[model samples]
Target: ALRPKLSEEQQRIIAILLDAHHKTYDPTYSDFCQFRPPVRVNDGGGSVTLELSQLSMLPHLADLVSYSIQKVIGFAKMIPGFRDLTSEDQIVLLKSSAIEVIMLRSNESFTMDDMSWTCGNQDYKYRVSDVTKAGHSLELIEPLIKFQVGLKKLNLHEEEHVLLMAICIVSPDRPGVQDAALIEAIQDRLSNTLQTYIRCRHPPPGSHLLYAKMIQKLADLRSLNEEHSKQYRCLSFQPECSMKLTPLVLEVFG
Candidate 1:
């Protein structure tokens, strides 16, 4: 529960978000599929059709994203430096990074073996990387899948995941940030906590590389999230796909 590298202040902040992380336990894909006959889409020779059951799934996705944003904000508010920021700055930081946080949290849902999402009924698997189905280009999907694979390789712990998220949320370089110095200092604390966590979890010879690798993964996370928004926009253009963007999502991506 304690890391030598983290100061008492950083330790206190870690405990706060760590508690929030547990309280906002993310549900699996099946948890979202609350209907009989799981949501399905058919590719009818280049035309896309959504089943009646599938219509609700879009909102469910939006709800999950909304839930993620709320939890991230809730956790951020608990951090000492984060709460010190003005209300406008707080909103800006959360909006800028909510999608990336959600994507990181949802890494469990993606199957690396086949680039699919193991969701809905146990019998059905959605191809998350399919351009026709997921609306993302191969350019994006390939890198995303690779990033997921890389993350899996690291075998990060729950604490590591949440700490990375906290660091991401307090990013100094995010556009429109009101207090870059405050946010940067917070980012430094979280980064130190993350590095301490890596050392404790991985230890000695291999720990150094793992620490460096995870930092690099943060960059990958940023890239993948931008691509996700692009794909979300593309999906919104389809008449049959009435996917409503949650208000938070609109503010973030717009």
Candidate 2:
């Protein structure tokens, strides 16, 4: 089929993620290409794996998967006694059977924070804000709010959500070679974003204890930064072809 028909529900879910992506990406780049979703996915009995190109095509599929989970959870929370369900039941029914929602592959190196600002041709600063909205209006910002709200509802308090948002704002899933420094910088900014948001939510609670632990995370950052420099900077001729570690954009600040 040249173009397959999607159910209203499926179409709505796609709308939510795409709206979120627009809110997240437009402030970063004026020209944002909406990626194509995969035409097929294979579940080889135990696991589901899509072609790397197919995975890359959707750009925001992880966000879609994550959002869908939250939507189900959010719906369940409103049910009369969903919480009364046994923990195993919750896992097996609400979480496990709904595997795609839970099995998103996130990159830790995504960032849309101020630390990695794209300097302008002219000397001035334009603050990049993550979009926020509500309702089913076509305004584009609503889906992001939905995505964020879904995470809160599902109790996913990890810095990974911030990292995912940063990716939505900065690098997309399209197949292409990208600047290593830029990727590292993006990850660094995600950590910064998490810290900023955390402190904002709990202004009186000093993050010093958090800082003590963050120092170690910073060591990892330093290592990544060094590798990025060595590989992409003017001095090095050849760098490792493989990605040594998973993306840590979310945890670098923790």
**Clashing residue pairs found in predicted model 2:** 108-247, 108-248, 108-249, 111-186
Q: Write the per-residue lDDT of candidate 2 for residues 110-132, one digit (tens) a residue.
A: 22333212323211121112100
- How well does candidate 2 score on lDDT at residue 116? 19
Candidate 2: how large is its RMSD?
A: 23.6
User: In candidate 1, how many clashes are counted?
Assistant: 0
Candidate 1 segments exceeding 4 Å error = 1-6, 27-38, 44-57, 111-120, 123-126, 129-134, 204-206, 239-243
lDDT of 2 at 133: 9
Each model's TM-score, in the order given?
0.79, 0.22
